Paper text:
As a control experiment, we also determined the cryo-EM map of yeast [name] in the presence of ATP-[name], a nucleotide analog that has been used to mimic the ATP-hydrolysis transition state and can trigger [name] ring closure. The map was resolved at the resolution of 3.58 Å (termed [name]-ATP-[name]), exhibiting a both-ring tightly closed conformation of [name].
The [name]/CCT complex assists in the folding of approximately 10% of cytosolic proteins through an ATP-driven conformational cycle, playing a crucial role in maintaining protein homeostasis. [name] is an ATP-dependent macromolecular machine that facilitates substrate binding and folding through ATP-driven conformational transitions. It consists of two identical stacked rings, each containing eight paralogous subunits (sharing ~25–40% sequence identity in the same organism) arranged in a specific order. An individual [name] subunit comprises three domains: an equatorial domain (E domain) that contains the ATP-binding site and forms intra- and inter-ring contacts, an apical domain (A domain) that comprises the interaction sites with target proteins, and an intermediate domain (I domain) that connects the other two domains.
Residue numbers in the entry:
A (entry chain Q): 260 to 414
B (entry chain D): 49 to 96
C (entry chain D): 241 to 432
D (entry chain B): 3 to 520
E (entry chain g): 5 to 75
F (entry chain H): 51 to 151, 158 to 400
G (entry chain E): 24 to 559
Write the structure that this text describes.
């Protein structure tokens, strides 16, 4: 976090500096691939050197900006995030049967949809409409029905 | 009285013509005539 | 005269806290050894040209030459070095290793005259081998307009002798050459 | 429907053809009175700083005066090319190209001649004009005596149109010898021109050597005999080495004093290698500090600082030496030799004069004038004379001037006009009458007759005498071989070719489009 | 064109009924204190400068310039 | 309709979606026609003009009803009930058409727009364009088309792969052969040139003897990545990051093609065209990850040279090169082709 | 209005809308204003035009692509014709003035059909069908010249060269220009007479001298002179040699330094003295690698320090400084050399070979320029043009540039036509004949396309002062009596209207694009109805 700088005293350390960073990501991503992890959710920008070994084992890459967007992803699969890059705990790994990418409104969307077994929480409703103005109030109209469900709990 | 804050009182014919700007090109050459007399000789530059 | 400051950027790294004591001792020792060699040649007057980048004389070196009774003058124009070299017959010293007695000039009396709130340094007498002596004249006056004109009046006077030494011979002024040439030409103009 | 934007000036009709021809008339009439030795100089009023410039050359007059007419810009560009190529005749090209449009204006209006027909008429007319100059060219390069004498007569013709026409007899030898010193070199950047204000205009002289305005730094004597001159271009003042990533790591200032002292040791070791050559004089184009200059005092070597790089090439050719860096090897390095080096003073500024130099491949010209306007004119007057004499060493063919060369070309134009027939005969004969204007204007500036005097020169050539010419002093027909009026053959072809090509430009413009200024 | 040069924009419906009722109520509200034996007085200032001080209903209305058309 | 915006950008469009994008509509109710025009163009791509004409007519027929005593919700009951029976009627109009197994549908989509009279030609390229895309994928980028100003639109031809612009002139470019008999395309994310490596540059060298080894070490590391490419026999190298003249000249003596500056969208089409893969490092390059094709030839089109990828046995990339006199002509043709592909 | 402001689009009052017949009349008259400008410069009897730039620079040309490029317009219809000639110059490079006249001729005949009540699409549908009938008719009339050997093939290149050289300034030298333009392709070309590379020929202009000094020089012409000009200007090879061994280096001469920012710390005087010897050892090593390789002239991209001025002078090694990166590619092609990235990779096989390296004095001062010559046929041909005016040196570039565009089009196999208006007349009568067989509503469409093709021959008679009626009637009557299509308009008046005896030859690919660019552009213009133009 303070004054990150490359220090090379002699040409001997310079020759092994290029291959040194490649072995660091390889050693860290190997423990994840050995656990059978086919998808990794990232919360910030990922460097190109890290994305190379993820394509070697066929591991998907997801970008989750800000916070609340990533917080509701773990509630679906029942996973516990950890800051380290080491091998995650097998008990903290989530379960998603299928991940699909199809065209809906002209752009590529990722499908987190669950199935009958291994039920998930925080489901989403795809809302299709001709005008964006109708899409705004129907979103608030659905929230009125969601808020009505809260009235079935406290009393 | 120069355009700046400096003021020069001089009887020398070359210094008068040098600090006095002239709008006529042929009359501007009279300044260079006094310079030719002062550089080579240095005396009698107001007579030329 | 100052602590060493090469043109190339240098980085002084102090590893030990005891090294800071040796640094302050060597900085004053570097300026002391320069002043010790000046006293060996019995040079009581030092002239320093205008300084660029670092200062000409450090304040720490002022105490060295003051206790030894040595007059110091700095901020001298570079174009005036040629006049001071031939005027006083002193060969300039650009290096402390090349500093010697033979390269130093000589003066009978060096005094700074302070009068009417104005200070001026004058040298009385010149003793040396010189084939091109110099001269200096002090100009006074009421204001800068009169003083500048007093000098401009001297330029016209110095050019009179220059024309006589360069070209030997002179004529009579006051209207003599204007009327004589006009009369001699009028006689020859009728014959053409 | 207007497709063009706002503030767009365009003329699709007679107004365009009228503005193109009249636009060249004001340009031709401006430089008309500047043609010939009897011409008058022009005055230029600057829009800033109030700097007046008086020059007889038409190249500077057209470039300084702002001209928004595209028809005028065509005559300005051909004058800049004529100055940069041959170095003289910028006025003759502008006048001759303007007269071609004068004869072409009456053919389109009165004679109703097609524009391309006038252009195609000059094509066959220029072929006879260039072939007429080839048979009239004489090559004197077979004899060094006759070739050197011709260089004097050419200089008298160029210097006649300028303010030097009175003293041109004394200045013809100065310009002739200066080109002989180059030994065939056409580069004029090797000759230095130092302008000095005051004194008689005839006091201009040419010394053998290199006159440098710079002076020795401090203690170096003014006059010294048998001094070897050395030139070093690079560094030698507080050497920075090369890379900028070098630094001094200092634990205590005791070691810092030894690091800076080692820099002075590199200075003393480099100057010590210079003394191995046995030279009494050293010259650096870069300015020399006080420490390296004092090292030459005990060695008895002169020092010179702040020399310009364009003067180094001028200095290397006078001394006949070689620029020397990397002093480690004395063998492969060569030094210059000079008999005596004295520091003189011309005016208020002292100068460095050289004498008895081995190589004469370069020199320095000193001029004297009453005003700076005459100094700026004297430098441009010699720049036009030295440029023609420089190209003469390459192409040694010469053609008689003074109205002779223009009338000889018109003799072959009238012959080819009969075999063409058609309507091009009016265009071909228009080129012959356009060649009459150059000798006619020579008589107009002198107050002579523009008809009977020209007719005497025309009738004398058709009688079998090709050596007849125009004499402006006596106002009659005189022989050009006896008067010594001759110009280079390259100048004759350049004026005819540039004017013929420039005339084909504006005659091809039916429409003039002016975009909104920015 | 501009079509009608007089009030091309129009205020109709309940907006015009409220403006007529509200302005009519303001006429009676100022004279509420002018009724009864304990009623107060009202002073009016004309552009001529003459002062009229009375509790009469008509003298107050005719000397006040109302910009509202229906009022 | 000819529309000129405040930037003096000429655009000629009859499309209801494009016309409403040029103009800036500040009217609240008039912006609803813009949403339905962009929504119709996003999914189907055709009929954006018919939707706006139909949506505006429903408001025109409801205009005399609002002047009467008909309530606002009573009118919406008529449209919502009629559209329910109208959708079921379209299913009766349609036919399963499983018999006879793109040609007829692409000709009708080009109507009302340019090159419609040329449908005897451009439609043949529209059929094989979508067929290169496998089911469940149907990528919208792999059908991308490049626009070349100048020329005639009848000179266009079909290409089995993507063609991109060089955008940069290499000093060792001409020394590289422009005709390959069996090229091997290698996609690399490495940056080949002399520069600081990762995110920071500093060097501390105490001794002059070790100062020479630091320079030679930088040349060996850059050349080490160059030797590993030559040992694999890759004729074509593509990279997103810039490539200096040092790596380009090394590939010139080996007869290896080099390129850079290519956008990320173009190299995504290269992986699908030759069936290769993206390698972000030179140490992991393996022979089985390199793609190939039948031939490689660089042809100049409108003072612009492009790299032609064609002849691959299986390629999902379709890129066309369009020509036309006006800058809008080349825009209208792709606009017709982009709308015609979405129909098939 | 009802009393409330009605604004559909921002800047309501700023933008204007045109519709109906007035919108079509403004589009036709916009093309007629551009046509009458180009019709005056069409043909060898045409006239140039002055182009004034906002910066003060002027341009004199008859080229429809250059005139419209620097032309500042307002109406967008006239701006569509700008890219029309630009489309002709970029690809084919010939006939930029013909596409504007032919396109406006189609719009002039279309305006008469619109006033008669014909739908604009029906007009565009008739021009598309008539365009393919004219191309297919002219394709059958021409013959294949590829059966001739290389001796006769050079003659056909000289025929089409002199045609494109006309109509432009300095057309008197076209005899030598045609010879120099063909020899450039003879030297640079494929052995199979196909797909010649145009980029190997560079156009380098020079301002000075006269037009008669223009000659072909095979090599590289650089604006930089020899560094430290104490060396001889003209470099000569050794007595026996394989060549001059030209060296090209993209690396300046400096002691090796890391590309990254470095800090060299000198902690003692002994470490500083080693840097002194280490400094001079590198400049001595770099100059020895060139001498051991036999190279003579060294080319540096970034130049070198003044230390090497005398070092390279002792070994008699010419050197240049500050050479552009684009010029380095041009150098290695001429001498067939290879750029050497560093001295460690320097070998004798990577050195270029040229005949002679020398510089010319040109004018009085000007600047110093380097010239390279080749001893045999090479892949580099540099054009050398001189002139007495800056405008002549400029226009002569694009004049010979368009001349090279005609020769490279003849490299394509089995495409040739004869110019002089003989192509438009032949294709005009073929379209008018089909109009009688088809009849229907499109009968008037083929008539408008036939009358538009005849405008080009009639335009040639206007600049030559002839009668367009009497000239067109002779050409139409000749094609009906005899099948020879080689009869056309003669603007030079040499007689013999047969193009075979006059040698005038044009590329078919150039004339085919003129019909395609004109027909396909008018199809888009006639579809324009609502015109929305925002205020500037």
């Amino acid at each position: 976090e303070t004054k990150g700088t490359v220090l090379l005293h002699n040409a001997q350390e310079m020759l092994d500096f290029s291959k040194g960073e490649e072995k660091q990501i390889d050693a860290m991503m190997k423990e994840i691939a050995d656990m059978g992890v086919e998808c990794i959710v990232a919360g910030a920008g990922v460097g190109e050197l890290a994305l190379h070994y993820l394509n070697r084992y066929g591991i998907l890459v997801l970008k989750v900006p800000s916070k609340f967007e990533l917080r509701r992803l773990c509630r679906v699969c029942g996973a516990t995030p950890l800051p380290r890059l080491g091998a995650p705990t097998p008990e903290e790994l989530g379960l998603v049967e299928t991940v699909k990418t199809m065209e809906i409104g002209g752009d590529r969307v990722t499908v987190f949809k669950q199935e009958q077994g291994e039920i998930s929480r925080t489901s989403t409703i795809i809302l299709r409409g001709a005008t964006q103005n109708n899409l705004d109030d129907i979103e608030r109209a659905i929230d009125d029905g969601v808020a009505a469900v809260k009235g079935l709990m406290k009393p | 009285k120069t355009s700046r804050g400096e003021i020069i009182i001089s009887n020398d014919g070359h210094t008068i013509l040098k600090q006095m700007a002239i709008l006529h090109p042929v009359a501007r050459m009279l300044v260079e005539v006094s310079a030719a007399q002062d550089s080579e000789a240095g005396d009698g530059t107001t007579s030329v | 005269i100052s602590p060493p400051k090469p043109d190339t950027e240098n980085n002084i790294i102090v590893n030990d806290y005891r090294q800071m004591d040796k640094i302050l001792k060597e900085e004053r020792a570097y300026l002391l050894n320069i002043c010790k060699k000046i006293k060996k040649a019995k040079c009581n007057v030092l002239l320093i040209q205008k300084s660029i980048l670092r200062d000409a004389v450090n304040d720490l070196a002022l105490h060295f030459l003051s206790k030894l009774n040595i007059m110091v003058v700095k901020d001298i124009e570079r174009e005036e070095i040629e006049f001071l070299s031939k005027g006083l017959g002193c060969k300039p010293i650009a290096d402390i290793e090349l500093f010697t007695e033979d390269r130093l000039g000589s003066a009978d009396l060096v005094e700074e005259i302070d009068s009417d709130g104005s200070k001026i340094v004058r040298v009385t007498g010149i003793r040396n081998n010189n084939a091109r002596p110099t001269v200096s004249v002090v100009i006074r006056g009421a204001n800068n307009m009169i003083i500048d004109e007093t000098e401009r009046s001297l330029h016209d006077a110095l050019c009179v002798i220059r024309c006589l030494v360069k070209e030997r011979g002179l004529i009579a002024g006051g209207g003599a050459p204007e009327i004589e040439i006009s009369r001699r030409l009028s006689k020859e103009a009728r014959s053409m | 429907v207007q497709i063009f934007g706002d503030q767009v000036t365009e003329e699709r009709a007679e107004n365009a053809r009228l503005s193109a021809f009249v636009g060249a008339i004001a340009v031709g009439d401006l430089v008309k009175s500047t043609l010939g030795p009897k011409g008058m100089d022009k005055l230029l009023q600057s829009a800033s700083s109030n700097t007046c410039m008086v020059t007889n050359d038409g190249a500077t007059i057209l470039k300084s005066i702002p001209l928004d007419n595209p028809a005028a810009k065509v005559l300005v560009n051909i004058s800049k090319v004529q100055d940069d190529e041959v170095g003289d005749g910028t006025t003759s090209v502008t006048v001759l190209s303007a007269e071609l449009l004068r004869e072409a204006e009456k053919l389109i209006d009165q004679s109703k001649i097609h524009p391309q027909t006038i252009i195609e008429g000059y094509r066959l007319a220029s072929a006879a004009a260039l072939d007429a100059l080839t048979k009239a060219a004489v090559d004197n390069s077979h004899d060094k005596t006759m070739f050197r004498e011709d260089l004097i007569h050419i200089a008298k013709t160029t210097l006649s149109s300028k303010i030097l026409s009175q003293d041109k007899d004394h200045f013809a030898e100065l310009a002739t010898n200066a080109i002989l010193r180059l030994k065939g070199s056409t580069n004029l950047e090797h000759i230095q021109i130092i302008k000095i204000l005051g004194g008689k205009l005839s006091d201009s002289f040419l010394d053998e050597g290199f006159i440098l305005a710079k002076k020795f730094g401090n203690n170096q004597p003014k006059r010294i005999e048998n001094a070897k001159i050395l030139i070093a271009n690079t560094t030698l003042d507080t050497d920075k080495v090369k890379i900028f990533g070098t630094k001094f790591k200092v634990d205590s200032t005791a070691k810092l004093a030894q690091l800076e002292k080692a820099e002075r040791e590199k200075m003393k070791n480099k100057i010590a290698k210079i003394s191995k050559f046995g030279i009494n004089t050293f010259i650096n184009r870069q300015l020399i500090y006080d420490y390296p200059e004092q090292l030459f005092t005990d060695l008895g070597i002169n020092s010179i600082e702040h020399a310009d790089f364009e003067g180094v090439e001028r200095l290397a050719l006078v001394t006949g030496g070689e620029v020397v860096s990397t002093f480690d090897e004395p063998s492969k390095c060569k030094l210059g030799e000079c008999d005596v080096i004295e520091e003189i003073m011309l005016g208020e500024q002292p100068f460095l004069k050289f004498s008895g130099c081995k190589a004469g491949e370069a020199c320095t010209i000193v001029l004297r004038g009453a005003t700076d306007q005459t100094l700026d004119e004297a430098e441009r007057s010699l720049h036009d004379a030295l440029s023609v004499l420089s190209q003469t060493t390459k192409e040694t063919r010469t053609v008689l001037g003074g109205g002779c060369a223009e009338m000889v070309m018109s003799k072959a134009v009238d012959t080819e006009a009969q075999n063409i027939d058609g309507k091009k005969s009016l265009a071909v004969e228009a080129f012959a009458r356009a060649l009459r204007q150059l000798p006619t204007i020579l008589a107009d500036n002198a107050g002579f007759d523009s008809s009977e005097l020209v007719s005497k020169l025309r009738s004398s050539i058709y009688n079998g005498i090709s050596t007849s010419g125009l004499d402006l002093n006596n106002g009659t027909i005189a022989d050009m071989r006896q008067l010594g009026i001759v110009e280079s053959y390259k100048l004759k072809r350049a004026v005819v070719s540039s004017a013929s090509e420039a005339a084909e430009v504006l005659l091809r413009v039916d429409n003039i489009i002016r975009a909104r200024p920015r | 064109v501009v079509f009608m040069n007089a009030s091309q924009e129009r205020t109709t419906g309940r907006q015009a009924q409220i403006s007529n009722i509200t302005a009519a109520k303001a006429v009676a509200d100022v004279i509420r204190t002018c009724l009864g034996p304990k009623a107060m007085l009202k002073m009016l200032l004309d552009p001529m400068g003459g002062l009229v001080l009375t509790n009469d209903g008509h003298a107050i209305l005719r000397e006040i310039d109302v910009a509202h058309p229906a009022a | 309709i000819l529309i000129v915006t405040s930037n003096q950008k000429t655009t000629i469009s009859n499309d209801g979606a494009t016309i409403l994008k040029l103009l800036d509509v500040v009217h609240p109710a008039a912006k609803t026609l813009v949403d339905i025009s962009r929504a119709q163009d996003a999914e189907v791509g055709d009929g954006t003009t018919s939707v706006t004409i139909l949506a505006g007519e429903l408001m025109k027929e409801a205009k005399p009803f609002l002047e009467e005593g008909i309530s606002s919700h009573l009118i919406m009951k008529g449209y919502r009930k009629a559209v329910s029976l109208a959708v079921e009627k379209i299913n009766e109009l349609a036919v399963d058409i499983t018999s006879e197994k793109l040609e007829r549908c692409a000709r009708t989509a080009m109507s009302s727009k340019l090159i419609h009279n040329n449908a005897d030609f451009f439609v043949k390229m529209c059929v094989d364009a979508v067929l290169s895309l496998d089911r469940n994928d149907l990528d919208d980028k792999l059908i991308g088309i490049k626009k070349i100003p100048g020329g005639a639109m009848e000179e266009s031809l079909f290409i089995n792969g993507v063609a991109f612009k060089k955008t940069f002139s290499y000093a060792g470019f001409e020394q590289q052969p422009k005709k390959f008999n069996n090229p091997k395309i290698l996609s690399l994310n490495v940056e080949l040139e002399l520069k600081a490596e990762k995110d920071n540059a500093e060097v501390r060298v105490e001794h002059v003897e070790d100062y020479q080894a630091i320079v030679d070490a930088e040349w060996q590391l850059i050349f080490e990545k160059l030797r590993q490419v030559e040992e694999t026999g890759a004729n074509i190298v593509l990279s997103k990051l810039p490539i200096g003249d040092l790596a380009t000249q090394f590939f010139a003596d080996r007869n290896i093609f080099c390129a850079g500056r290519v956008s990320a969208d173009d190299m995504n089409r290269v992986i699908q065209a030759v069936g290769g893969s993206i390698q972000s490092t030179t140490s992991d390059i393996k022979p089985e990850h390199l793609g190939t094709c039948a031939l490689f030839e660089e042809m100049q089109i409108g003072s612009e040279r492009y790299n032609l990828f064609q002849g691959c046995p299986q390629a999902k990339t379709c890129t066309l090169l369009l020509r036309g006199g006006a800058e809008q002509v080349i825009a209208e043709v792709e606009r017709s082709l982009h709308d015609a592909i979405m129909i098939v | 209005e009802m009393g409330r402001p009605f604004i559909i689009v921002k800047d309501q009052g700023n933008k204007k809308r045109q519709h109906g017949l007035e919108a079509k009349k403004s589009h036709i008259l916009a093309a007629r204003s551009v046509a009458s400008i180009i019709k005056t410069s069409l043909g060898p009897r045409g006239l140039d035009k002055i182009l004034i730039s906002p910066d003060g620079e002027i341009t004199i040309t008859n080229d429809g692509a250059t005139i419209l490029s620097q032309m500042e317009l307002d109406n967008e219809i006239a701006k569509l014709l700008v890219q029309l000639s630009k489309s002709q110059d970029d690809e084919i490079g010939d006939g930029t003035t013909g596409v504007v006249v032919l396109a406006s001729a189609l719009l002039d005949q279309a305006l008469e059909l619109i006033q008669k009540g014909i739908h604009p699409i029906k007009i565009a549908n008739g021009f598309d069908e008539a365009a393919k009938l004219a191309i297919s008719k002219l394709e059958e009339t021409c013959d294949d010249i590829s059966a001739s050997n290389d001796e006769l093939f050079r003659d056909f290149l000289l025929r089409a060269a002199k045609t494109s050289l006309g109509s432009k300034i300095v057309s008197k030298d076209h005899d030598r220009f045609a010879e120099m333009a063909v020899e450039a392709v003879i030297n640079v070309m494929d052995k199979d007479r196909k797909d010649v590379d145009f980029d190997l020929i560079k156009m380098q202009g020079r301002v000075g001298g006269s037009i008669s000094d223009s000659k072909l020089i095979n090599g590289v012409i650089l604006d930089k002179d020899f560094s430290h000009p104490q060396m001889p200007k003209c470099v000569l090879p050794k007595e026996g040699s394989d060549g001059v061994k030209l060296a090209i280096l993209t690396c300046p001469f400096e002691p090796p330094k890391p590309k990254t920012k470095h800090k060299l710390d000198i902690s003692s005087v002994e470490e500083y003295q080693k840097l002194q010897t280490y400094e001079q050892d590198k400049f001595k090593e770099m100059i020895d690698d060139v001498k051991k390789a036999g190279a003579d002239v060294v080319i540096c991209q970034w130049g070198f320090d003044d230390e090497a001025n005398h070092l390279l002078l002792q070994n008699d090694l010419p050197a240049v400084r500050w050479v552009g990166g684009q010029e380095l590619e041009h150098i290695a092609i001429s001498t067939n050399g290879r750029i050497v990235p560093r001295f460690q990779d320097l070998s004798k096989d990577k050195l270029g070979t040229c005949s002679r390296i020398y510089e010319q004095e040109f004018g009085t001062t000007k600047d110093r320029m380097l010239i390279i010559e080749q001893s045999k046929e090479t892949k580099t041909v540099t054009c050398f043009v001189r002139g007495s005016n800056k405008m002549i040196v400029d226009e002569a570039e694009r004049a010979l540039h368009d001349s090279l565009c005609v020769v490279r089009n003849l490299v394509k196999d089995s495409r040739v036509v004869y110019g002089g208006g003989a192509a438009e007349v032949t294709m005009s009568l073929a379209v008018s004949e089909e109009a009688d067989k088809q009849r229907g509503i499109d009968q008037y469409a083929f008539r408008g396309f036939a009358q538009a093709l005849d405008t080009i021959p009639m335009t040639l008679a206007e600049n030559s002062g002839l009668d367009p009626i009497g000239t067109l009637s002779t050409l139409k009557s000749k094609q009906l009596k005899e099948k020879i299509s080689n009869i056309g308009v003669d603007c030079l008046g040499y007689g013999s209207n047969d193009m075979k005896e006059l040698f005038v030859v044009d590329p078919f690919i150039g004339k085919k694009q003129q019909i395609l660019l004109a027909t396909q552009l008018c199809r888009m213009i006639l579809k324009i109805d609502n015109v929305i133009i925002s205020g500037k």
